[PDB]
């Protein structure tokens, strides 16, 4: 039997770890940028550091449904970027938290110590997000958020405009929900490892 990258147990494990990291990061961004009120969040521990978890069931289910779709894309190494876009009441983008991801074309079948230094890496990103409010101006009241995903274009590109994954429909975002005229770029953290390279930065409206 011939195996593809996604068939590797290691690929599935890393995808699970990274998908959960994105969930923790999204919750934290929503908290520190006050997209949702502080009242719905509760302090919890992840990667041995304090994090903030929404206790609103609807929002939690939405975030899980969204990110569950990214999991298979991660296993196949087709994800290039996952972005959390914060928009004002005028539907204009005010901040964008960009998570760039690269993974090797394969992972070892000798899964021995696959996740040995991964936690320290994820922890560093969470800590940077935790204090990001110190380098950003407060957002206007009434903001909302959208999650954007960029993948690598394969051979037989799918031309379908409404692509469904795990019973969740996705569509192409419009220029309005993304375009920012020469925004301020703020690097947060860039790290590498044998199983992943990730770069997080924020784009802030001028």
């Amino acid at each position: 039997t011939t195996l593809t990258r996604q068939d590797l147990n290691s690929a599935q494990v890393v995808a699970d770890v990274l998908s959960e990291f994105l969930e923790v990061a999204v919750h934290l961004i929503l908290y520190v940028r006050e997209v949702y009120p502080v009242g719905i969040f509760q302090k919890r521990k992840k990667y041995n550091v304090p994090v903030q978890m929404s206790c609103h069931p609807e929002l939690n289910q939405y975030i899980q449904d969204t990110l569950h779709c990214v999991k298979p894309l991660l296993e196949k190494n087709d994800v290039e970027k996952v972005v959390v876009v914060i928009l004002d009441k005028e539907h204009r983008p005010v901040e964008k938290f960009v998570f760039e991801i690269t993974q090797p074309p394969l992972l070892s079948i000798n899964s021995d110590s696959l996740l040995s230094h991964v936690e320290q890496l994820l922890r560093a990103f969470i800590l940077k997000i935790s204090k990001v409010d110190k380098v950003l101006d407060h957002n206007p009241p009434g903001c909302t958020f959208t999650v954007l995903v960029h993948t690598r274009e394969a051979a037989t590109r799918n031309m379908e405009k409404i692509q469904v994954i795990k019973d969740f429909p996705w569509i192409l975002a419009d220029e309005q929900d993304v375009h920012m005229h020469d925004p301020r770029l703020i690097p947060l953290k860039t790290m590498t490892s044998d199983i992943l390279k990730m770069q997080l930065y924020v784009e802030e409206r001028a």
């Binding site: 929002l59 290039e80 959208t146 274009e153 409404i162 969740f168 192409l172």
Partner: peptide, 22 residues
Amino acid sequence: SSGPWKPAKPAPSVSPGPWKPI
């Protein structure tokens, strides 16, 4: 590259939003 792709379902508000299928 392909994207940016976004969920067709918008993020939920604290209390449910209005009826507007299109």
